[PDB]
Amino acid sequence: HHHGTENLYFQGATMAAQSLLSIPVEYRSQVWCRANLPYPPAPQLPIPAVVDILTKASQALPQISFSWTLIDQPPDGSLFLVWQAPTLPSPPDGMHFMSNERFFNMDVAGKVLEIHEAKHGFYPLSETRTMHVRCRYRLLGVGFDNFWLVHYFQGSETDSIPANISVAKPPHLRRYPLPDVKTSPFLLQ
Ligand SMILES: [Cl-]
């Protein structure tokens, strides 16, 4: 009646469900399911690098843990491996955008790579011009459909445009300060 779509994804994911239930209800919509790696930071990745990173993560999955955690204003270079349903909205990350996220599809070795590219990213508390890009990648048909590489990096000078939260997406500033909510680790395979 509120959770039918989420429930589909937690049929098999019991540990992940148990961990989310340990979080106060008001923060359950706010957390990412993020791998405990962490990835070394990187500039914008070549497409074959993206495909290799997701492929290696799919092969290593039984030895990689995840925590529910808040992501906020990550520095340029930040790369995360996340578990997320493609039919649910991305949780907040403190970034706002002056343009709509664009969805591209590439064929790589007979597989679909999704590229969700959000240019014109800004941090409204500290930026009056856009300075960032967020990309969300996933690789389909390799048994890793609901896992994503999320990458934050510096925008080009030419793409920088005036920023104003009043017309940005998402439309609401998140509430600060953030609570400490990071769960103990769990497995997803
Ligand atoms: Cl637009």
From Swiss-Prot:
Top-level lineage group: Eukaryota
Subcellular location: Cytoplasm; Nucleus
Family: Belongs to the SSR4 family.
Function: Component of the chromatin structure remodeling complex (RSC), which is involved in transcription regulation and nucleosome positioning. Controls particularly membrane and organelle development genes. Part of the SWI/SNF complex, an ATP-dependent chromatin remodeling complex, required for the positive and negative regulation of gene expression of a large number of genes. It changes chromatin structure by altering DNA-histone contacts within a nucleosome, leading eventually to a change in nucleosome position, thus facilitating or repressing binding of gene-specific transcription factors.
Subunit structure: Component of the RSC complex composed of at least arp9, arp42, rsc1, rsc4, rsc7, rsc9, rsc58, sfh1, snf21, ssr1, ssr2, ssr3 and ssr4. The complex interacts with histone and histone variant components of centromeric chromatin. Component of the SWI/SNF global transcription activator complex composed of at least arp9, arp42, snf5, snf22, snf30, sbf59, sol1, ssr1, ssr2, ssr3, ssr4 and tfg3.
Name of the molecule in the record: SWI/SNF and RSC complexes subunit ssr4
UniProt organism field: Schizosaccharomyces pombe (strain 972 / ATCC 24843) (Fission yeast)
Lineage: Eukaryota, Fungi, Dikarya, Ascomycota, Taphrinomycotina
Parent-protein residues present: 3 to 179 of 395
